[PDB]
Amino acid sequence: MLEANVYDNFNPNYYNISDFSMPNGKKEKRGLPIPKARCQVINYELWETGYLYTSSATLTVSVEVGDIVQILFPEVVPIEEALGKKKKLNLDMVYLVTDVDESNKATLKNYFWAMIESLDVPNAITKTTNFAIIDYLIDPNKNNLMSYGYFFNSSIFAGKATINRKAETSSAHDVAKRIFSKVQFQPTTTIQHAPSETDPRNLLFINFASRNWNRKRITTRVDIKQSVTMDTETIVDRSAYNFAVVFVKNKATDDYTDPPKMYIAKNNGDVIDYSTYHGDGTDLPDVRTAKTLFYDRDDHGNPPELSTIKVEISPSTIVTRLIFNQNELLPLYVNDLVDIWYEGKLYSGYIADRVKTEFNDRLIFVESGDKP
Amino acid sequence: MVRQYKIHTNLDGTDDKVWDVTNGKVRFYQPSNLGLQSTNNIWQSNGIGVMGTRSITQPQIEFKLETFGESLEENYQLMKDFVNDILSKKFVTLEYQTEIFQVYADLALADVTKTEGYGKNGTFSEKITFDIITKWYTYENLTFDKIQNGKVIAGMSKIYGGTAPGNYKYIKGTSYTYYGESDIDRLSRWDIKEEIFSFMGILYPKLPKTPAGVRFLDDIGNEYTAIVFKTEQVQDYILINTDVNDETYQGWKGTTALNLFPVMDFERYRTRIIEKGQMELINLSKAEFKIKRKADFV
Amino acid sequence: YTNTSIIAGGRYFELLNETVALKGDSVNYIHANIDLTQTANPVSLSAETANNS
Ligand SMILES: [Ca+2]
């Protein structure tokens, strides 16, 4: 079994107060408490980041909804916080109790996703770099749960933030998912005692750091023997009816009296009128997914742009997800850039999640796409 | 004459320990079922019969574990030993031997019983149940074949002989047939006649930093899979096991064992299942192979 | 380590063709471990995650 530390809810209405007198004399934030009970986590399905599934585990002590569960491992993870600076960090799996049944089986939600809950973010914040969004999302003054610090690899979140659809107000969950897909990284919450020996506080931090500051791409093979589960995910939201029966309203009748114009999307990506086609069908799709679209003529009176129709019939990012057993010959840990060979086909992406169960040790591989 | 059952801790391995369950102190008796159950997925429409795919299912073998020991101390020492020895290794290979064949089955301990109904000098009479990993496979030695030059015959072979400046005659049927080939010692074939499922090869490399290992070709001369490694120094030998349960890809230099899995070419190694054709040696001076091939009923 | 001599804590020892296993895509910190109670073999080598001196 694994060891588990059970604490009461890390209420930021209590812990965010900077009244604690440090040994030197300085006034700082309130440190994390001691576990109300030391128990042992048993009959477990424990994820590392909580990318797809929520963790579930039975616990010896009678835990209740709200309590924080810190699962301990007798091993250490070295995170590169600065180019040369590597810090000794202890392996932890921190969750929030969402629901306990009659048989004391607790439904555990990964601390980070349970922290950025109900938080909404406007398009104005998303206009800047990915660092600005992370600095907004991780704040104990706003979040439902207490936060002390954030470790983040500057190179991975250096790039310009992904463009938002309709420039609307999105939830912290949807933006994080959209950002974490492009950066090819996943967050891990860790409880560890303050770095300075003078500070006696136990603190909770969020991890956006890796074993290598400048991440390198790995090349590996996944055999059918590892109980492989193949399923297709969609990163970007784009429409599914590749053929469009487009109708344009007549100005004189203020009605759709005029016949429709059919538009087909080629295999390359371009959108053409169906009547204009002069080919052999090799450059057109294998299956015709169709929809009927209605458009209103602009103030100028001109028909709607080809490009505007194109966006609605354009293809979505078909991405392959692979869930398999941990290979001891070539171990794959979370937040690693990999190139997986499966049944003669090459899939490129990252390790998003990791399940620590009683029977097996499994990985969630997410193909980042961007192949041609 | 009579059949032989032998439990092996690790077959194909240096740390092997064999227990004779036919002649030794601890014996297996009256196997429950050595046959097979098949599910053919047959559906009948209006009296006409349609057959799907046959899933050959293997059933648990339940033996009659019986120890013969001089004292109560001896038989308790036999039960503690035999069971721990099966438990120590993740799976144990049971050898089935008769006048006609020598098959093997990969087994996993399903259930073992210990009761206080002792016979004479405290002798056990219990039931030992096993789960089937792979039922009946042949563990045999795979070797290459050599090609030799045909003899030179006057009038039959292409030579300019007899009266000067030589002569070779075109006849009907006998005419001219080439004797052989210059340097026929280059041709070697590692023939694969039936589909094999796993193997234990001992590869001795030639040149360092040049990919060394094996490649497999089909009946038309096309590569389908290849286990090849690019090491920095010349390994004394690369010990490879394709067995699914304990896959091993290790290189040896002196007394030091190195894991060669990350150095391997992952693109070339497409499958484990070897098909009918031939095998080639990439940058190898010598190779020793042991091939294991399945049989459903024996 | 084909031939590498190390003086750790004033104790001299030679590494003669001593091979140490490594972690894939990681920064391995090779340590010299001395345990005087292990009278047969006091020096042992280990590739670790961080500098645990
Ligand atoms: Ca073996």
Curated annotation (Swiss-Prot), chain C:
Which sequence ranges form a coiled-coil region, renumbered to this chain?
none
Location(s) in or outside the cell: Virion
Top-rank taxon of the source lineage equals: Viruses
Can you state the subunit structure given in the record? Homotrimer; found as an assembly of 6 homotrimers. Interacts with host phosphopolysaccharides; this allows the virus to bind the external cell wall layer. Interacts with the distal tail protein.
Domain comment quoted from the record = The C-terminus is involved in host receptor binding. Host-recognition domains point upwards, towards the capsid.
Per the record, the similarity remark reads: Belongs to the skunalikevirus receptor binding protein family.
Free-text function comment from the UniProt entry = Binds to the host phosphopolysaccharides at the onset of infection. Upon activation by calcium, the receptor binding proteins change their conformation, presenting their binding sites to the host, and a channel opens at the bottom of the baseplate for DNA ejection.
Q: What is this protein called?
A: Receptor binding protein
